[PDB]
Amino acid sequence: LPDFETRCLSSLSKVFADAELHDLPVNTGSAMWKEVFSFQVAYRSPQLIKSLKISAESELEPYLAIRAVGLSPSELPVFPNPDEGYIRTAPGLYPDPLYPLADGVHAVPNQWRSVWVTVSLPSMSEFIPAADIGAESVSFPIDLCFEDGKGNHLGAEKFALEIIFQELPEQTLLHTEWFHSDCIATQYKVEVFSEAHWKLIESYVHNAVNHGVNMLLTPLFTPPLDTYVGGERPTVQLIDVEITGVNEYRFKFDRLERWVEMCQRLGIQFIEFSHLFTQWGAKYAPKIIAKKDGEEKRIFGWDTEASGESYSLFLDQFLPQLVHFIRNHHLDDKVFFHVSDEPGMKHAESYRQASDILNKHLAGFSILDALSDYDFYEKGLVQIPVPSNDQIEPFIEHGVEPLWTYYCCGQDHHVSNRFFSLSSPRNRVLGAQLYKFGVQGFLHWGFNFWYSQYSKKVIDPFKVTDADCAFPSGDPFVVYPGADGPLDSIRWEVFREGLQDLRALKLLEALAGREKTLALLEQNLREELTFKSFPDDIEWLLSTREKINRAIKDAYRAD
Ligand SMILES: CC1=N[C@@H]2[C@@H](O)[C@@H](O)[C@@H](CO)O[C@@H]2S1
Ligand SMILES: [Br-]
Ligand SMILES: [Br-]
């Protein structure tokens, strides 16, 4: 029999196959009802052992999954001059995708590998095992077993999960991760809005909702994002347009009704309409296709100026009809609009002209856009600014409400992000930051972006994770394409943990008040928590959440 060693670890370790493992063992934790709780087990052999049999024994087995932590390439792990908090800076193989056990799991000579364990807890009232509804908590063991192909025992670890008998309350943070339907169609080689495409969209949206996405980017017309000037992405257009004469249109909303019904069925709460003017300037219209005498033709795009009377007349016809749709489906308090993403100060006049067209028709509706110039908000050009987390200080200082934030490739220094080359505490700490600063919404551009920069070519996300050496690996997507639907990354699992932390902090505030809650979160910090300053440390984050959980368990409750 070969030598075989194991180590039980938290969800916040990243186990590399080319390095010694310094992380300390973790064999206990706590959670609430409705929480997803995760851990992992690292293992190593001097020998090549193929097709390990890995099993768990627990009363929690109906709620438990086990997956293999796979390795992904990164050619651009970092931009120049990365800060000292980065875990690695070299190109190589990084732990990231989570694969089904049925795909096969191996021990590879003198390499630490990992399996990842997910426990998706129900409500107390749906829980199948016996449980004392009058106890403050109950602990359950989870035993994980490794055998070879022939049934010889190789290793084991025991984890003890304490479940506290309170429910993690429903998320009220607004959270959008931009959803690229085109990337689904080109990966799976299906036509846009075929029945095969709709089935895949549903699977991808269900994953998003399960990970705390409650606001979905909704493609009225092909979203004008990450597209070179004079280029295109695959047509994704929910609105049907018939051109009936020069500057004269008729509209049908049937595909939009299908999309909205899908959102309501799967648990999306807010409809975020796609941008109506081109990125980084608001200079042009999106690609728009229409039918003339049965035949499809492009009527708007990079050859139709945003300020031209042609696009103005089109929107004067379209937008009142979309408002009628919104009122007829009782969506009045459930919608957001976009003008144009990421304008600079040099683009303020064009952004204003575009905003003025929408404001003729969309009075009473929420309008937001990603942009970070406070000087740009002062002049009333944008209703809800969404500043980046490294530029948020002036928005906080001036009491802007509702407060939103985002991050992307530009947020490479100090702040929370989700790059391969950053630690899992640096990802998960966002939750605590959103709590302390009273943030109302979080936006990310990259649920499943699987093209290169400017959408010049299709890439394979299992081979190219940096959009062809443009964006640090991890920025453009959190899910990979499995055979029948999405595969999670460890980064996506850790992001959900941050959201859960925010929900736990808000519960402790309901029970004990904001002053005591903030005092607990900041206990023994050398410096105040900010978006740029925090302990990047596994023990700090785990012990802080354990303290929050203990305070909830011990609090005096009303019925
Ligand atoms: C809201 C955003 N808009 C941009 C996206 O379209 C991408 O280019 C991304 C790259 O990191 O950067 C920003 S994040
Ligand atoms: Br051996
Ligand atoms: Br929340």
**Of ligand 1's atoms, which has the minimum distance to the CA of residue 225?**
6
CATH 2.60.40.10 assigned to 5-169: yes
Å from CA of 21 to ligand 2 middle: 19
Q: How many residues does the chain have?
A: 559
Ligand 1 pocket, residue 369 CB under 6 Å: no
CB of residue 225 inside a 6 A radius of ligand 1: yes
Question: If you measure from the C-alpha of residue 6 to the centroid of ligand 2, how many angstroms do you get, rounded to a whole number?
Answer: 14
Tell me the C-alpha distance between 384 and 403, whole Å: 8
Spatial separation of the C-alpha atoms in residues 526 and 493, rounded to whole Å: 29
How far apart are the CA of 22 and the centre of ligand 3, in A? Answer: 34
* CA distance linking residue 372 with residue 265, whole number of Å: 35
Q: Which residues pair with 40 in a beta bridge?
A: 9, 116
Distance 501 CA to ligand 3 centre (A): 9
Contact yes or no for 467/180 (Cβ under 8 A): no
> Which helix or strand (DSSP H or E) is residue 395 part of?
helix 393-397
Q: Residues with Cβ < 8 Å from 120, sequence gap 6 or more?
A: 36, 63, 65
By most ligand atoms within 8 Å of CB, the mutation choice from 178, 226, 278, 455 for ligand 1 is 226
* Cβ atoms 458, 189 nearer than 8 A: no
Q: CB count, 10 Å around CB of 428?
A: 27
Distance 110 CA to ligand 2 centre (A): 10
Residue nearest to atom 12 of ligand 1 (CA): 408
Residue with tokens 């908090």: 85
- Tell me, what DSSP letter sits at residue 345? G
As to burial, measured by CB atoms within 10 angstroms (0-12 exposed, 13-18 middle, 19+ buried), residue 95 is: buried
* Tokens linked to 261: 């019904």
**Which residue's CA is the closest to the ligand 1 atom numbered 2?**
445
Establish whether residue 144 lines the binding site of ligand 1, counting it when its CB lies within 6 angstroms of any ligand atom.
no
Residues 468/473/474/478 CA torsion (nearest 10 deg):
40
Tokens of 427: 């990802």
| Minimum CA distance residue for ligand 1 atom 14 | 408
**Residue 546 class from Cβ within 10 Å (0-12 exposed, 13-18 middle, 19+ buried)?**
middle
What are 240's strand-pairing partners? Answer: 252
Q: Which of 183, 79, 76, 193 lies closest to 457 in space, CA to CA? A: 183
Contact 493, 480 (CB under 8 A): no
Going by CA atoms, what residue is nearest to atom 8 of ligand 1? 226
Burial class (CB in 10 A: 0-12, 13-18, 19+), 327: exposed
Q: How far apart are CA 252 and CA 239, in angstroms?
A: 6
**Cβ of 226 below 6 Å from ligand 1:** yes
248 membership: H or E segment, kind and range? strand 248-252
Residue 124's SS3 state is helix
- Whose tokens are 């990992």? That residue is 114
CB proximity list for 71: less than 8 A, separation 6 or greater? 17, 93, 94, 95, 96
Token pair of 306, please?
């945003």
Q: List all residues 6 or more positions away from 126 whose beta carbon is below 8 Å from its beta carbon.
A: none
Using the atom order of ligand 1, give the atom closest to the CA of residue 471: 11
Give the Cα separation of 438 and 440 in Å (integer). Answer: 6
Cα 408 to middle of ligand 1, angstroms: 6
In short, whether 272's Cβ falls inside 6 Å of ligand 1 is no
Contact 281, 343 (CB under 8 A): yes
Domain spans, the chain: 5-169
Neighbours of 198 (CB within 10 A): 16
CB 29 within 8 A of CB 39: yes
* CB of residue 406 inside a 6 A radius of ligand 1: yes
Angle (CA) 298-303-304 rounded to 5° is 85
DSSP state of 23: P
If 0-12 CB within 10 Å is exposed, 13-18 middle and 19+ buried, where does residue 124 land? middle
- The rounded distance, in Å, linking the Cα atoms of 531 and 506 is 18
Residue 541: both structure tokens together: 């984050």
503 CA to centre of ligand 3 in angstroms: 5
Q: How far apart are CA 527 and CA 521, in angstroms?
A: 12
* Burial status of residue 59 (CB atoms within 10 A of its CB: 0-12, 13-18, 19 or more): middle
Structure tokens given for 126? 């749906």
Q: Strand 486-488 to strand 479-481: parallel, antiparallel, or no bridges (unpaired)?
A: antiparallel
471 Cβ below 6 A of ligand 1: yes
Q: How far does the centroid of ligand 3 lie from the alpha carbon of residue 358, in Å?
A: 31
CA distance 388 to 475: 14
**Minimum-distance ligand 1 atom for the alpha carbon of 449:** 7
Closest ligand to C-alpha of residue 44 is 2
For residue 232, the 8-state DSSP code is -
State the Cα–Cα distance between residues 284 and 304, nearest whole angstrom.
6
Q: Which ligand is nearest to the CA of 4?
A: 2
Ligand 1 neighbour 341 (Cβ under 6 A): yes
Q: How far is the CA of 2 from the centre of ligand 1 (A)?
A: 49
**Could you give the C-alpha distances from 388 to 276, 339, 370, 408, in angstroms and in order?**
22, 18, 8, 8
Q: What does this entry list as its resolution, in Å? A: 1.6
Contacts of 449 (CB under 8 A, 6+ apart): 178, 180, 183, 226, 467, 476, 477
> After what residue numbers is the chain broken, C–N > 2.5 angstroms?
none
Does 342 sit in the ligand 1 pocket, CB within 6 Å? Answer: yes
Q: Is the CB of 445 under 6 A from ligand 1?
A: yes
Residue 95 CA, ligand 2 centroid: distance in Å: 25
Ligand number nearest to the C-alpha of 1: 2
- Is any ligand 1 atom within 6 A of the Cβ of residue 529? no
Torsion angle defined by CA atoms of residues 381, 384, 388 and 392, in that order, rounded to the nearest 10 degrees:
90
Going by C-alpha positions, the residue among 154, 264, 233 that lies closest to residue 457 is: 233
What residue's CA is closest to ligand 1, atom 13?
A: 408
Taking the alpha carbons of 298, 303, 307, 310 in that order, is the dihedral positive or negative?
negative
- For residue 177 and ligand 1, the question of a CB distance below 6 A is answered with no
Q: Is the CB of 409 under 6 A from ligand 1?
A: yes
Q: Please, are residues 399 and 393 in contact by the beta-carbon 8 Å criterion?
A: no
Q: How far is the CA of 219 from the centre of ligand 3 (A)?
A: 26
Query: Ligand 1 mean position to 513 CA, how many Å?
Result: 37
Answer yes or no: is the C-beta of 371 below 6 A from any ligand 1 atom.
no
